[PDB]
Each structure stands twice: as C-alpha cells, then as structure tokens.
C-alpha cells in the first residue's frame, strides 16, 4: 500500500504483474510437457522429470515476484492463464527446442524489466532481478543448448535409439 | 493411448480433464488469497500461510489426476485458467466464506465424477476418488466450518481485535 | 463353513475359485517366461528377472484370494492348471506383448468379478478387489505399455542392439 | 590514502561520511526508543527489545560504511551526533510511526547515494549498497508497515488492551 | 461367590452395583458433552477434549468398582443406562455448570456408600473409596470451580471473545 511505497513506479508495478503472468504460463507449459512424456506411448521418464522440475522452478519464480511486489507496496493483479501452445509436443528434440524458445522469451522479458527499472532509477529492482533471475536463465539456456547439441549428435536413421540413450544416460 | 486403455470411457476421460482445470483454478484462487493477506495493509501472516498451504494441496490434487489420466491411457487436454473471482478479498471471515464456497463446488464436482464413474461401471475410478479425494474434502470443509464459527464468535464491535486473536491463536 | 458365512453368494464363491485358477495359470506362465530368458541361447538376465518377479506377484495374488475365500466361509476348489500357451516366447517385444495380453485378461476377470459382487450387493468383496487388485493391475499394465513403446523405439535393423540396451539400461 | 584510491570520487567520500552521521543518529534514536519503553510507567518489554535490536542493526550499518570508506582509501570525518527528536515517544503506534519515518529518511539517503555513485560511474559502491543495504531497508519497512496495520486493527476504545496483546503475541 | 466372600454385606453389594450404573451414566453424559463441542457450529476443541478425558476417567471408575465387586465375591448386575439429560448443552459456562452438578451427585453417592460401609463395619470398602475415589472427586470439583470463576470473569457483552480465549489459553 501507500504507507510503505517508496521509489516504486506504477510502470514497474504493472510490468511486474505482467511478468508474473508470463511465469504462470511458463510453469503451465512445463506441466503439460512433463505429463506428455509420461504418456504410455511416449514413455521417457527422464524427459518427463526434467520438465516437471522446470515447472517447479518457474513456480518459485512467480512466487518470488509476488513476494517482492508486496514488499515494495505494489498490488498484484491476476489475469487468465493462457493454455500451452501445443497439445502434443513431438519428440525430445522438438520439445527441447520449444523449451529453449520459451526460456529466451522469459529472459527477454527479464531484460526488458531491468531496462525499465534502470530508466526509473530503481536500484532495488535491478539488484533483485540480477541476484535471483538473470544468472539462473543464462545457466538454464546454456544447459538446454548443450542438450540440443547432444540430441543432434544422436540424430539420423537411428534417432529412436539415440533418444532412448539420451534419456537413460544424460537425463 | 489405446494399447493400455481398458474399461475407461471417453466421458470419464473428458470429465477428468474438466476436473483438472477446476483444480488448477482453485489453486490459482488460493495463490491470490495467500498473497492478499501478505499485503502490508492486511498483514495477517497466519491467514496468508493457511491459504498458501491450500494452494499447494490443490496442486497435488491436479497432479494426482493428471497421473491417473496417463495410467488409464487417457489424454490430458489443457484449457485457459480463469483468473480468481476477486482482486481483493475483504477480511478473514469474508475470505473463509469464499474458500468454503469454493471447496463445496470442488466437492460437488468430485461427487458428480463419482456418479459418472458408477454409471459407466468403472470401479478403479471410484476407488481412486474415494481414497485420495472424498475424505480429504470432508475434513477440509469441516475445518473451515469450525473456523467460521469461531470467527463469528469473535465478531461484533471489537471484530478487529477478534480477527487478530484468531490469526495469532488458531492459525 | 456355514457358521461364519454371511452375505456371501454361491456365485461369487464359485467365481473366486475360477479366478484363483486363472492366477495359478498366470503365475505358471511367468515361471515359463522367466526361465526361457535364462536359456544360454537367449541370455537376457534382466528380462528373466522381470518375469520371475511377476510370477511371485501372481502367487501372492492367488494366496490372498484363497485367504479371503476362507475368511468369508467359502470353500476353495482346485482344478488342473493348464500349461503355458507357448513353449518358446520369441524375443523381448514378443514376450512383453504376450504378458500384456495376459494382464488384460486378468484385469477383465477382476472387473467381471467386481460387477458380479455389485450385482449381489457384496461391499466387502468390492472393497477387497479395489484395495488389493485393481490399482495393482492398472500400474502394471501402464508399465508394460511404457516398455513396449521403448522397445518399439529401439526396433529396426539394429533391433538386436536395442534389445541388449533395454535389458541393460531399463530392466 | 592516495596509494590505494582508484575511481573513488571526493563527492562520494563526502556523502559516505554524511551517511555515517545519519546512521549514528538513527542508532542513537533507537537507543532512546528502547529505554523509553523500559520505563516503569510504560513497561512494554517486547517493544523495548524491538527498538534495542534496531539500534544494534544501525550500528552494524555505520561500521560497515566506515570499513568501506577505509577500503576505498577515503578518510572518515566525524561530526556531532544530534540528540533524538523526542524525549518521550507516546504509545507503541506513535513510536512505530516515528520509526517508519526515520527508516524512509535513511532509505532515501541510500537511494540518493546510489544515484550519486551511478553518476560518477562507481560500480563497486553501487554493488556495496545493493548487497548490504537496499534489501535490508525494504524488508524492515515492510515489517513496520505490517506492525502498523495490526496496531490500527487493535485500536479503538480498548486500545490499551490491544497494545498489551500486540506486545505479548507479536513482539 | 460364597467361597471367598467375607464381611461383605448384601447391602453394600447392591449399593456398589447402583454406583456402577451411576458411573456408566456419567461417562455417557461426558461422551455426549465431548462430541457436542466438536460440532462445526460449536467448535471448541479444548472444551471437547476436556469432556472426552472425563468420560475416560469415569470409565476407569466403574471398571475399578466392577473389579472390586469380583474381588469381594459380590455379583455385578447391570441395568439400562439412561441417556444424558440434554441433547444440546448450550455454551461452555452452561456445560461446566452441568458437569459440576453431575460431579456433586457422584460425590454424594460416594459419601453415602462410605457411610453405608461404616455402618456395616467394612474397613476394606472404606479404604477403597478413600484411596481411589474421594480425593479424586475433591480435586476435580475444585478444578471445575476454578474454571467457572474464570468463565464468569470473562462474561459480559464480549462473552464470545471470552469463551474463545478460555478455550485457547486455559484448556
């Protein structure tokens, strides 16, 4: 509320609420990816677990944002959460590419929020994003990059065999 | 998929997907209730924690349903998640009444699913609902009933004092 | 005997005895599958162990049924146990398909018994089947489904290599 | 001294010395608040302890600033420490409001120092303020906000009873 | 039976059987009081637990009497157990008053039995009552007296608040 609010622009407040919805949607997407790979006709446990962990990670993300919103005196506003872009996600490489695209979108949103925070000279918001979000995304994107390179290395006519080995030996 | 599906009607499958969306929405509602009470101008930690725990409980609920869907060979279909009905939830009694109404809606949905499962003679679905959901709702609704009675007992001109004591000594 | 028998129809009693013979036969089939894969010209230890465990599981099944029969006052009647349908079971995918078909037959028999118990309004029998048998079959069938999908993913010209990897890394 | 000084403007040096005096004064104010509530005619132990802890917190603050000043090669200059603004602080709500006002003044001073550090492109000073001061103030101000809301909730004709309960159950 | 009976009058035997029925009825009454306060529209856990403990205490009472009856060679004779005097017990003060009245009735019955035992010069019965019953009643009645005084101290317009505090802080 107004009693504790200090140097917290209404623009950042609104942008933080927007970011919260983006994280809710990312978490929802990983939930879908997680259970897709648990289907009896896909059956890649390691892949399922990989995405379910990410869903959990994104949840912590929006919870941390919601907490910060209250600490600065902002007010959280919730909107509908759009369903995942796909009902079925293809094979592991396909799903990893979609995950990569999603993380880059999230990272760009974090970068945009930081630029907005800098423009409004809000050092606390800047520190918050850098400490709890920016490095986390960089490492995650690097890991997905590594996975994609290994999946591609396992492609070809015996791609099925490769997908199995990757799930067994890497995930 | 079709390879493992046995005695699992398309009607139940569809109804289970519907129930999953209802639990996603309930969880979303409790998330909102949880952070509302964490606001500096509401500040009732015990109440905030009570609702955040419930959000977690509902999450386990839909995850269990999603798992069951895959075990029976059904296919999960996700839809948009509607935002909570309120942006602000008033005082503790108001929020508890809303929570109560929500749980009764969920319980009715569980009862309807069970009736549908009985009509299609699906004993596994019946057992699943009875073992992991029905008793849980009954106990939760009983607890909320108890809380409401105590909050009412603490009402009157000094309702503010009562709300504080309830959060400190009960929650 | 008659002294303790209450609400236990002769139809269920007879059907339970029939189910016991079906489980004895399933156990016998898994015993055969288990030792087939232990042959020096098949040599897939992980597969052998997988089926020997299932033989043990089915044994517990009929022992539990026999115990229940005595608890309700019914009388167990034993019949000849037919030999397994095959002398040799082919390769892992072939054997897994046969196992899958067998489990579905057992599951259908359990479902039929439950329907019979419902028609005779025998809530104890219903509870017994749901608690100790129905969920067990569902999870087992799901697991076999998963295995088949992975075996198919490992099929093709280098199927021999795939069968080896599956036994080493999954079983 | 000059031998180790690098990229440390005389403006920041002077501003840091100013901030040190502000923290010395804040600590002095909390010392006064702490012992006021220890008086036999006020007697609110929990409140006394709350403010004495804050005095300790502010002490760590200026000690950390003094240490940093020496690490950058700046020279600490001390000035008289003005006595607290009040001799008597009224009741708990009154004292909490004064504490809140004080923290906002300190937070603004930290923000101004950070802006000054940014204008002189001193990334070390920026990092130092963000890591050891900014988040600390935000959380403290949020906590005081929460306390004020609860004290207000306990106001009215029976305010004396409310003040007692708050000290006993919250502090 | 007659083989071990010595100095045990038929009058005491009959009176002991009467006392057993009185304790059975007291236990039954506390069972009712216990669950009444567990109702969702009463919801006072501490009060519910207080009365359920007393039900247990009275049970030990009649079991001890039944044991003594057999030790002296008397024969226990059971009669119908009358239902509790009330279906609903009002508020805590009301219930505590009823409990107090009940204990005084039990205590008087114990005193009457002791007088009867003295008149028949049965020192063992006297010792038995004094050692296992008389002091127990005195302490219990004192405790209920204390509770009533505190409940009265908490009466008035804000009686609801008082009843809540008593359950939370005393029971």
């Amino acid at each position: 509320s107004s009693q504790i609010r200090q140097n917290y622009s209404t623009d950042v407040e609104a942008a933080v609420n927007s970011l919260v919805n983006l994280y809710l949607q990312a978490s929802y997407t990983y939930l879908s990816l997680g259970f897709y790979f648990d289907r009896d006709d896909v059956a890649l446990e390691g892949v399922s677990h990989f995405f379910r962990e990410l869903a959990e990670e994104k949840r912590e993300g929006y919870e941390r944002l919601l907490k910060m919103q209250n600490q600065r005196g902002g007010r959280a506003l919730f909107q509908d959460i759009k369903k995942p872009a796909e009902d079925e996600w293809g094979k592991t490489p396909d799903a990893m590419k979609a995950a990569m695209a999603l993380e880059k979108k999230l990272n760009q949103a974090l970068l945009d929020l930081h630029a907005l925070g800098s423009a409004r000279t809000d050092p606390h918001l800047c520190d918050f994003l850098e400490t709890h979000f920016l490095d986390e995304e960089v490492k995650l994107i690097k890991k997905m990059g590594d996975h994609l390179t290994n999946l591609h290395r396992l492609g070809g006519p015996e791609a099925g065999l490769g997908e199995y080995l990757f799930e067994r030996l890497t995930l």
Side-chain angles (χ1 to χ4, degrees), chain A residues 1-38:
Chain A
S1 78
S2 170
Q3 89 180 319
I4 70 169
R5 188 170 189 148
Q6 181 174 38
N7 195 44
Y8 194 55
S9 66
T10 50
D11 292 344
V12 169
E13 179 180 9
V16 168
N17 279 326
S18 176
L19 184 61
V20 165
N21 184 271
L22 197 58
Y23 268 73
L24 279 162
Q25 210 278 170
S27 187
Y28 193 22
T29 292
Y30 283 129
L31 177 70
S32 179
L33 279 159
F35 283 92
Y36 168 76
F37 281 97
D38 177 59

Side-chain angles (χ1 to χ4, degrees), chain A residues 73-106:
Chain A
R75 293 201 192 303
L77 290 180
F78 299 101
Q79 299 303 313
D80 289 353
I81 305 174
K82 300 302 178 183
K83 64 175 182 176
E86 303 288 3
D87 289 314
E88 286 185 351
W89 307 89
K91 299 174 179 177
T92 307
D94 304 308
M96 204 63 80
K97 286 182 185 182
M100 172 71 96
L102 177 62
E103 291 308 321
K104 283 181 174 178
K105 177 182 181 178
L106 241 50

Side-chain angles (χ1 to χ4, degrees), chain A residues 123-135:
Chain A
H124 180 272
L125 179 80
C126 164
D127 172 67
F128 174 82
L129 253 35
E130 287 166 26
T131 300
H132 303 293
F133 290 91
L134 303 187
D135 195 30

Side-chain angles (χ1 to χ4, degrees), chain A residues 151-163:
Chain A
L151 284 170
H152 174 280
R153 166 181 287 127
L154 293 169
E158 40 189 53
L161 174 66
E163 196 175 8

Side-chain angles (χ1 to χ4, degrees), chain A residues 16-17 19-21 24 59-72 74-78 128 133:
Chain A
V16 168
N17 279 326
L19 184 61
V20 165
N21 184 271
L24 279 162
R59 178 186 84 289
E60 288 181 354
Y62 64 71
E63 288 183 350
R64 189 173 298 124
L65 288 170
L66 256 12
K67 190 68 176 186
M68 184 271 274
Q69 184 73 292
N70 275 355
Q71 292 181 306
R72 293 303 298 283
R75 293 201 192 303
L77 290 180
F78 299 101
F128 174 82
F133 290 91

